[PDB]
Each structure stands twice: as structure tokens, then as C-alpha cells.
């Protein structure tokens, strides 16, 4: 499987950018989460970025902190997330699925065992939020041994040595956080990095169009989707319709 290469190859022949929603697995319940994800795909999401609830998500702001709390209230465990991942993959054979992890859940039962389990359920990529490239060697080596793409964040304060490490070590895509933007994309394709997805504060269709025009292969909406869930917790049917309208509007914006 190279779902990301296939996704980007087709997107580029259709001169589209990728739209990638983030959502926490099991938020607000396991069954409602499974329906949220099916709505996001059907409305036109090109790939998925999925969080596993962790007790101490020190790299996340309040919207994702509350999403984790809702999922923990529903009894969601790492093992139940993996069960959910197998179901999603069974329904949707071609969409790339990326996990956003914290290092302790990857380390807990053995680094190699974690990536083996991702390969088994058909996960395509893993970003470990609290592992910098300097500490990444055992993680990305385990990822490569199990045909998992290791995803690295390229932050705004990145220098050149970081760009070269990110470009050599990453696969699938580069996670871009917001040095001029256009210059970052160009240095990254200079160093033959995986296609860059812009992931900072992507809230409106106009931002999706800007990212693609600026040279990025697409955009990740890192919390605007979780806000829609938070807004509409009491009305599940209004939740899915708002999610459907937002995602199709954002995905229309990627058609440049």
C-alpha cells in the first residue's frame, strides 16, 4: 500500500489540493465518532488524521484537550481505538489514515509492537507529537520496518538543518505549521521532502485556497472540525449536517 502517493498522484492530475480533517477517535462516543468519520469521508475529505485520547496532551490546545476528555468519559481506550481503526479501514479501503500519537502510548507496549499493530489495521502514517527529529531514530526505524510513514512537524521557527532532517526522515507528507511561508515550501521541495500539508489555523475555505496557491499540497483542519462537534453535542443530527456542509465547502476550496 502507498495510499499517500496514490492520493497525491490523482489529486495532482485533477489539480486539487488535499483536505484533511482531524478528529479525536471516540469523541463524543464510539458509535457517534464512527458516524462522524463516515460523514467526513462521504462529504469529500481526501484523507484522515485521527487522535488517540491521551491523559496529558501537552502539545494540544483547549479544543483538543476537551475532545480527549469527552472520549475518556465514553470509556475509549487505545485498544478500542484500534478496533475502530480496523472497522474504518474495512469500510474505506483507499483513504489514507494518519494517527496523531503521544510518545507514551507508542512506547507503552513496545515501540516495534505499536507499529506492527498499525500495519495490521491498515494505518498509513504516524505523527508522534512529542518526539522531535533529534529523538526520533527508534520511532521512525520501527515505522519504516512496518511500512508506516513517519510524519514530522516543520514548525515556524525551523532552521535549515531542521528542514534537511525533516526532508530526509519524513514520508507520506510534511506537517507544516504556518520565515516566509512560500520560502518554506520551496526549501522543502528543494530537499525533496514529502508533500507539505499546511496545518496552522485552517478554518475557512479561503485559507484552503491560499495554502494550495502558496505551493502546499493541501491543508489539515486541526481543530475547526472538533469545534463543530463541541458546538452541536446536544443535537447529533445537526452535528452531522454542519460537518457535511463545512467539509464539502472546504473541499470545494481545494479545487484551484
Amino acid at each position: 500500500m502507498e495510499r499517500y502517493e496514490n492520493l497525491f498522484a490523482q489529486l495532482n492530475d485533477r489539480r486539487e489540493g488535499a483536505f484533511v480533517p482531524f478528529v479525536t477517535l471516540g469523541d463524543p462516543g464510539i458509535e457517534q465518532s464512527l458516524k462522524i468519520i463516515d460523514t467526513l469521508i462521504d462529504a469529500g475529505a481526501d484523507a484522515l488524521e485521527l487522535g488517540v485520547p491521551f491523559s496529558d496532551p501537552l502539545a494540544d490546545g483547549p479544543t483538543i484537550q476537551n475532545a480527549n476528555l469527552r472520549a475518556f468519559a465514553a470509556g475509549v481506550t487505545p485498544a478500542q481505538c484500534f478496533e475502530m481503526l480496523a472497522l474504518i479501514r474495512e469500510k474505506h479501503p483507499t483513504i489514507p489514515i494518519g494517527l496523531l500519537m503521544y510518545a507514551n502510548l507508542v512506547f507503552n507496549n513496545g515501540i516495534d509492537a505499536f507499529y506492527a499493530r498499525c500495519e495490521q489495521v491498515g494505518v498509513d502514517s504516524v505523527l508522534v507529537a512529542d518526539v522531535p527529529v533529534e529523538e526520533s531514530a527508534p520511532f521512525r526505524q520501527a515505522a519504516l520496518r512496518h511500512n508506516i510513514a513517519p510524519i514530522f512537524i516543520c514548525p515556524p521557527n525551523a532552521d535549515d538543518d531542521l528542514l534537511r532532517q525533516v526532508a530526509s526522515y519524513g514520508r507520506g507528507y510534511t506537517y507544516l505549521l504556518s520565515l516566509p511561508l512560500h520560502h518554506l515550501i520551496e526549501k522543502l521541495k528543494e530537499y525533496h521532502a514529502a508533500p507539505a500539508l499546511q496545518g496552522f489555523g485552517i478554518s475557512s475555505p479561503e485559507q484552503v485556497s491560499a495554502a494550495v496557491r502558496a505551493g502546499a499540497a493541501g491543508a489539515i483542519s486541526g481543530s475547526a472540525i472538533v469545534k463543530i462537534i463541541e458546538k452541536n453535542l446536544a443535537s447529533p443530527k445537526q452535528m452531522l449536517a454542519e460537518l457535511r456542509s463545512f467539509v464539502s465547502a472546504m473541499k470545494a476550496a481545494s479545487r484551484a
Partner: protein, 394 residues
């Protein structure tokens, strides 16, 4: 990559989001040059001597060891300005922040002692100070919150998560990722990402340096063992550091046993937790079987840190230092004994260390041994807690 080793054996590291790595590299470089800078060393020593009260006394206990062959000394960090050893390292870190051109201080606190210490260092040195505190801990430590506010610190409550220390440790990191240009993160113990385990040790190590000179002056020999309680590890590693190469000196760290190890309600990650990755380090921690991070439990709020400094886990693994635990009840008894026989009210934290020294003495009363306990703070802050427990019992 880095100037110093971020690892102690297999423990430690810099497990932070990529965005914080430049801040840690800047901090490590400033620390290494401050350490080679006689001007920095003299400013630091001047503050410790003329503002905080160093050197602190080394008191020989007169009455507590009667009828045994133990000689017990107490290193009196309870006489330090602020009433706890924390004052040593916040002064060093505040001078470091100024050296780096920073003007703001971020700190986390649980029981409130680190927040008080950071607030007083910030007021002295002209730094604006904001302090994150779990709203559970705000409610339960309103004396310490008033102190911080009197000293001009901005206190910010955290309701995220379990709203305790660990969740305050997270929001301080989020703040610092955006503000490290102008703000320094004043971490409260000898844990977290490199270079903090190294910095806090070096800014606490005078405890051991003084103890060694003081014990050689008084007894003409090194102690058989030095004993210190271990919440995050800063007071213990500060006592230990200068004795590490004196391999005849026992090093004993004491973790809180809570209601008993077997109850599951304790705070002893080093001996009874499991290695994991959190708060920027690979270290033993309190965690569930799924990899979620639990809280410690102890009667003393100051031993609430659910992990331990990585240098301690290293020292344990190679057998240089031994780690034990002491229950709530053993600590309470030691608290009462020091009051009645020596006229010193110890912190409930420090009482765990003293309780283990009393155990060594009582179990083998004819063993000749020279012990030093690090009395990491005074117990005025604990008298209400102790009073209520003793009323609830009789």
C-alpha cells in the same frame, strides 16, 4: 545537537514538540556559559549568602537518638529564606533568565511552594511572573496563592484534565512554546526535558557541598549515609551530588508510600512505577496499564509529582543509590517525634526522610552509624493538616 549529554544511562532525553527544541538549545548554551562565568557565580553566591541565608546549619540531634549508637545530623534547609530548599534553584534560574535577556517567568506549582519561590525570586530580580496551578490545588492552597499574589505574581488556574500538578506542567509548556522569546520557563524540580535535570541539580548542589565540609569539620569523617525524600528529586540530588564519587557514603532516597505500596495509593514511581515517556523525559512514572498517566498520592502535597528525575532512576539502576518508601503514618510519627524531642517542626515532605533514618536507628539500635538527613523544609505549612488528622484519630 547538544553540548551536554541529555541522557543518564537510558533515562532522560528531550521529548518535546519540535517547536520547543530551540528554546531548550538556547537554555543549554546559556547555562554552559553561565557555569564558566566567574561573574555569574559571584552574583549567584552573593544572593544565596546575603538574601537567602546560606550556608545553612548542620544540627546534631541531641535527644532523638538516645539509647542507640546512631549519630544523626540535620541539614537545615528549613532555615532558608522561604522555608524550603526550592529557593536555591529559583534564584539561579532567575539569574539565568536575566542573562538570556528574558523578562518574564513561567512556572507551574502544585502544593504552592514552587510558586511562592518563583514569585519571590521574580519580585527580587525585576521579572514579571505568571504561575499555572491546577484549580484543585488553587482551592486547597489559598494561603500559598495569596502569598504569590502579595509578591506580584499572576496566578492562573488550570481546570484541564485532573486540574492538578501534571496538568499545570502541560499548560506552562504550551505558554512557553509561544513566548520563549521573552519568557523563561522556571521548572520546579530535577526532571523534565534536558537541560533541566542538569540545571536544577547544579543549582541545588551546594546542599551537599556544604554538608560535606560541615560534617568533616564536626566529625572528622564522611557520613555512613545521607537520606533525602524524593518527590521530583531536586533536594535529594542536591544533597547527593557531591558524595556520588565518595563510594563509601550511602545515598538513600525516600519516596512517599502513601497508604501503603500494596494499596496502590502511593507516590513511589521509581521503585513501583514503570518506565514511560512524559513531561519531556524517559523515566519511571505512575501510569495505568494502557499508558495513561496517574497521579501520585501522599499526605504531603509536595511529593505529588507522578514521576521522578532521570538521574535518580540512573543512580538506582547502577546500584549507586538505594530507594525506599515511607507511609503516611510513618511520616506523621516522625513529624511528631522531631517536634517533641528537638523543637523543630519539619515539613511533612522532609518527615519521610527522617522517618527512614529513625527506622534504621530503631531496627538495629546497637549499630554504630553516622547519618545526615536533608531537612528540606519547615512544617509550619503542615500544622493544619496534621491537626485535622490527629483530631480525626483522637
Amino acid at each position: 545537537t547538544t553540548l551536554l549529554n541529555p541522557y543518564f544511562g537510558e533515562f532522560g532525553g528531550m521529548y518535546v514538540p519540535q517547536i520547543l527544541m530551540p528554546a531548550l538549545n538556547q537554555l543549554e548554551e546559556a547555562f554552559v556559559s553561565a557555569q564558566k562565568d566567574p561573574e555569574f557565580q559571584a552574583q549567584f553566591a552573593d544572593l544565596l549568602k546575603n538574601y537567602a541565608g546560606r550556608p545553612t546549619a548542620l544540627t546534631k540531634c541531641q535527644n532523638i537518638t538516645a539509647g542507640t549508637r546512631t549519630t544523626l545530623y540535620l541539614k537545615r534547609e528549613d532555615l532558608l529564606h522561604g522555608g524550603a530548599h526550592k529557593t536555591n534553584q529559583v534564584l539561579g534560574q532567575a539569574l539565568l533568565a536575566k542573562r538570556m535577556g528574558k523578562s518574564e517567568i513561567i512556572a507551574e506549582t502544585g502544593a504552592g511552594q514552587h510558586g511562592v519561590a518563583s514569585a519571590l525570586a521574580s519580585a527580587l530580580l525585576g521579572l514579571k511572573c505568571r504561575i499555572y496551578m491546577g484549580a484543585k490545588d488553587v482551592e486547597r492552597q489559598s494561603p500559598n496563592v495569596f502569598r504569590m499574589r502579595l509578591m506580584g505574581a499572576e496566578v492562573i488556574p488550570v481546570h484541564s484534565g485532573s486540574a492538578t500538578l501534571k496538568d499545570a506542567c502541560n499548560e506552562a509548556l504550551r505558554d512557553w512554546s509561544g513566548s520563549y522569546e521573552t519568557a523563561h520557563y522556571m521548572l520546579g524540580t530535577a526532571a523534565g526535558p534536558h537541560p533541566y535535570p542538569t540545571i536544577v541539580r547544579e543549582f541545588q548542589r551546594m546542599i551537599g557541598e556544604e554538608t560535606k565540609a560541615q560534617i568533616l569539620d564536626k566529625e572528622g569523617r564522611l557520613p555512613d549515609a545521607v537520606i533525602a525524600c524524593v518527590g521530583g528529586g531536586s533536594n535529594a540530588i542536591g544533597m547527593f551530588a557531591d558524595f556520588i564519587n565518595d563510594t563509601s557514603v550511602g545515598l538513600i532516597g525516600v519516596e512517599p508510600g502513601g497508604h501503603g505500596i500494596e494499596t496502590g495509593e502511593h507516590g513511589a514511581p521509581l521503585k513501583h512505577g514503570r518506565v514511560g515517556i512524559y513531561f519531556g523525559m524517559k523515566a519511571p512514572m505512575m501510569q495505568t496499564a494502557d499508558g495513561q498517566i496517574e497521579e501520585s498520592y501522599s499526605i504531603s502535597a509536595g511529593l505529588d509529582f507522578p514521576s521522578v528525575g532521570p538521574q535518580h532512576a540512573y543512580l538506582n539502576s547502577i546500584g549507586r543509590a538505594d530507594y525506599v518508601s515511607i507511609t503516611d503514618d510513618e511520616a506523621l510519627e516522625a513529624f511528631k517525634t522531631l517536634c517533641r524531642h528537638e523543637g523543630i517542626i519539619p515539613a511533612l515532605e522532609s518527615s519521610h526522610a527522617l522517618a527512614h533514618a529513625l527506622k534504621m536507628m530503631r531496627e538495629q539500635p546497637e549499630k554504630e552509624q553516622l547519618l545526615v538527613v536533608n531537612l528540606s523544609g519547615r512544617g509550619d505549612k503542615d500544622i493544619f493538616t496534621v491537626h485535622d488528622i490527629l483530631k480525626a484519630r483522637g
